[PDB]
Paper text:
PerR belongs to the Fur (ferric uptake regulator) super family known to be dimeric, metal-binding regulators. PerR has been identified as a repressor that blocks transcription initiation by binding to a specific site (the per box) in the promoter region of target genes.
We solved the crystal structure of PerR to 1.6 Å resolution by three-wavelength MAD phasing, using zinc as the anomalous scatter. Each subunit consists of six α-helices (α1 to α6) and six β-strands (β1 to β6). No exogenous zinc was added during the process of protein purification or crystallization, suggesting that an endogenous zinc is normally bound at the regulatory site, coordinated with residues His4, His6, Asn15, His19, His97, His99 in a pseudo octahedral geometry. The results showed that mutations in the residues of the zinc-finger motif or of the regulatory site, abolished the DNA binding ability of PerR, but not the control residues H44A and N101A. The overall conformation of our GAS PerR-Zn-Zn structure is substantially different from that of the B. subtilis PerR-Zn-Mn structure, which displays a DNA-binding-competent conformation. Our recombinant GAS PerR protein with a DNA-binding activity, however, exhibits a DNA-binding-incompetent conformation similar to the B. subtilis apo-PerR-Zn structure. SAXS studies show that the crystallographic structure of GAS PerR is indeed consistent with its solution formation. This study strongly suggests that residues Arg21, Arg26, Arg31, Asn69, Tyr67, Asn68, Lys71 and Lys83, located on the positively charged patch, are involved in PerR interaction with DNA. In the model, the DNA-binding interface is contributed from two adjacent PerR homodimers in tetrameric assembly. This distinct DNA-binding feature explains that PerR dimer alone is in the DNA-binding-incompetent conformation.
Numbering used by the authors:
A (entry chain B): 1 to 157
B (entry chain A): 1 to 149
């Protein structure tokens, strides 16, 4: 979506929850499960696939529940509906962003930026290693604009 | 460049370093300086711009040296050349990759994969904050094939 900040670092999962809280959308345990499922998914599952995979942990989950949750995620801009030719089945893919800190090596001042790239790292990590990716903590380092304008320091951090 | 592994984590800089070593290409101080510059650049500079930017902190840098080292990087597939006219101005695009570790949460066994994305993070980090990005250490975590189900 549009470039913005929540004034703190948030991974993909925590970002979704923050956005949903901002909109006063209730965060059920089922909703958390579906978000995490979609984030971890290394394919583009149908509604039925999501339903079948989460069914054991959630006996009270129905296909309607999955549709309801996907509707929220698609509208709030964290999941896209994809199509394959000749197939009428809708497939879903998580592409939601995250927010990453950049820390000044000299003064320690922190800024944050919106990232959509680490999820692509997660996909490549899975494909090339076979690992089911759990987390990719990322922190950037650099020189803040104010420190760029000053002379070279005698010490860092 | 095809997917491959060096059996160790390597950032963009160290990766370029490992690649030329593998092919017995000499590593000089000028070569290092130009590789580092190209990796950290957020634009596509001309040879003259590379020269002018590097000279104050590398006084022995010359335009000829810039062309020489760029040719090595272009031939080795790390830099692509862009032309938009017929004068002697060419622009240079660093197309690197790096290798990132994935660590198993359960057993701790490490694998690595080829990444072309963290350099794009660095670009976005600069554009959104104004910081001159110096480094972005990255390690992935997951469950290795053996520890799964
Ligand atoms: Zn956000
Ligand atoms: Zn600073
Ligand atoms: Zn390599
Ligand atoms: Zn393991």
């Amino acid at each position: 979506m549009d470039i913005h900040s929540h004034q703190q670092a948030l991974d993909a999962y925590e970002n979704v929850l923050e956005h949903l809280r901002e909109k006063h959308i209730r965060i059920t345990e089922t909703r958390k499960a579906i978000i995490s499922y979609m984030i971890q998914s290394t394919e583009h599952p149908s509604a039925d696939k999501i339903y079948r995979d989460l069914q054991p942990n959630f006996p009270n989950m129905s296909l309607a529940t999955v549709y309801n949750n996907l509707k929220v995620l698609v509208d709030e801009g964290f999941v896209s509906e994809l199509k394959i030719s000749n197939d009428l089945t809708t497939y879903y893919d998580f592409m939601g962003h995250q927010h990453v800190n950049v820390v000044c090596e000299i003064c320690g001042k922190i800024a944050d930026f919106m990232d959509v790239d680490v999820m692509d790292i997660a996909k490549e990590a899975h494909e090339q290693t076979g690992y089911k990716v759990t987390r990719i903590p990322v922190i950037a380092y650099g020189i803040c604009p104010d420190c760029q304008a000053k002379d070279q320091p005698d010490f860092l951090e």
